[PDB]
């Protein structure tokens, strides 16, 4: 887009076209037809979550302190 | 003794005991003066026999039956105290009330994970 003073180029991050966007769309369908879930990449969360799950296990604290609940 | 007289006549009887824990506490009070060495938590050494020789005559028989309900106090809310602990073996239906439920206003405060029946 060119204007009186400004000019701006709206780039895009990957090659675009009916040839390639359709392959992307077909994969996006396949993964919903056959329930393919990828793992996220967050190793930090994956570690903290596991340490928390292990620490919180068989804790039985609420039987022990007579907290009504 | 009164219930056993009614039982032997051939009848069937209801016997309600308002707190059977006071029958053994009154034994703990007397025990040390009778010159008997203390046992686990200060209880008389004959706790299980004092309790059995009573709980054994309150039963139904071929000639007549006694149905009973007994209130059993639990000291300091501790269900593993010797006196409650030695009583569970003498009952067919045990209904265990709890403070952590009554203090929710939920009455009767019966604990269903601890009540049981033969």
């Amino acid at each position: 887009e060119v204007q009186p003073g400004n000019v701006t180029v709206l780039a895009d991050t990957a090659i675009r076209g009916q040839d390639l966007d359709e392959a992307r769309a077909m994969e996006a369908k396949r993964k919903a037809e056959e329930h393919i879930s990828s793992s996220h990449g967050d190793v930090d969360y994956a570690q903290a979550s596991a340490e928390l799950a292990k620490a919180i296990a068989q804790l039985r604290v609420i039987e022990l302190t007579k907290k009504a609940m | 003794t009164m219930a056993e007289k009614f039982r032997d006549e051939g009848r069937d009887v209801l016997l309600f005991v308002d707190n059977i824990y006071r029958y053994t506490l009154a034994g703990t009070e007397v025990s040390a003066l009778l010159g008997r060495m203390p046992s686990a938590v200060g209880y008389q050494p004959t706790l299980a026999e004092e309790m059995g020789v009573l709980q054994e005559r309150i039963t139904s028989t071929k000639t007549g039956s006694i149905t009973s309900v007994q209130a059993v106090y639990v000291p300091a809310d501790d269900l593993t105290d010797p006196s409650p602990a030695t009583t569970f073996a003498h009952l067919d239906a045990t209904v265990v009330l709890s403070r952590q439920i009554a203090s929710l206003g939920i009455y009767p405060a019966v604990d269903p994970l601890d009540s049981t029946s033969r």
Side-chain angles (χ1 to χ4, degrees):
Chain A
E1 196 231 13
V2 186
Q3 247 185 52
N6 306 282
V7 45
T8 62
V9 180
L10 307 186
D12 37 26
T13 64
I15 307 297
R16 302 301 298 278
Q18 172 54 39
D19 322 88
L20 293 155
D21 297 26
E22 196 63 11
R24 292 183 189 274
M26 294 313 304
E27 174 143 289
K29 286 176 197 161
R30 190 191 78 251
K31 290 181 184 163
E33 290 167 332
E34 304 173 325
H35 311 72
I36 295 164
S37 292
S38 178
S39 81
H40 56 85
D42 195 349
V43 74
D44 292 343
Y45 168 90
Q47 265 203 90
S49 165
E51 307 310 342
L52 181 66
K54 280 183 287 178
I56 210 160
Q58 318 219 319
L59 189 59
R60 312 208 330 285
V61 157
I62 296 290
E63 98 186 4
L64 189 52
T65 176
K66 303 312 181 179
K67 185 164 178 66
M69 190 167 284
Chain B
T1 297
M2 302 172 181
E4 293 190 273
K5 173 69 183 182
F6 288 140
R7 184 184 75 210
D8 290 6
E9 287 178 17
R11 312 189 189 276
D12 66 49
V13 192
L14 268 50
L15 165 58
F16 300 93
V17 185
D18 190 14
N19 214 333
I20 201 73
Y21 170 61
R22 314 291 191 209
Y23 160 74
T24 67
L25 174 64
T28 293
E29 291 182 15
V30 149
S31 177
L33 303 181
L34 295 176
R36 307 195 294 215
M37 286 185 65
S39 166
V41 190
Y43 278 98
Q44 62 266 45
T46 67
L47 171 68
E49 174 164 1
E50 284 186 353
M51 191 182 296
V53 83
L54 174 90
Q55 291 277 2
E56 281 299 274
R57 23 191 300 215
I58 164 168
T59 58
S60 46
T61 87
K62 283 166 181 170
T63 184
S65 65
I66 295 175
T67 305
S68 62
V69 185
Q70 299 175 318
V72 185
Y73 171 99
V74 170
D77 300 4
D78 188 358
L79 282 160
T80 71
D81 190 285
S83 178
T86 53
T87 306
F88 279 90
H90 282 104
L91 304 166
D92 299 324
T94 62
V95 176
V96 170
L97 310 155
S98 72
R99 193 180 307 283
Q100 297 86 30
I101 296 175
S103 71
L104 266 44
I106 285 166
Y107 289 104
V110 172
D111 186 346
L113 300 180
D114 219 337
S115 307
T116 277
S117 175
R118 190 67 56 189

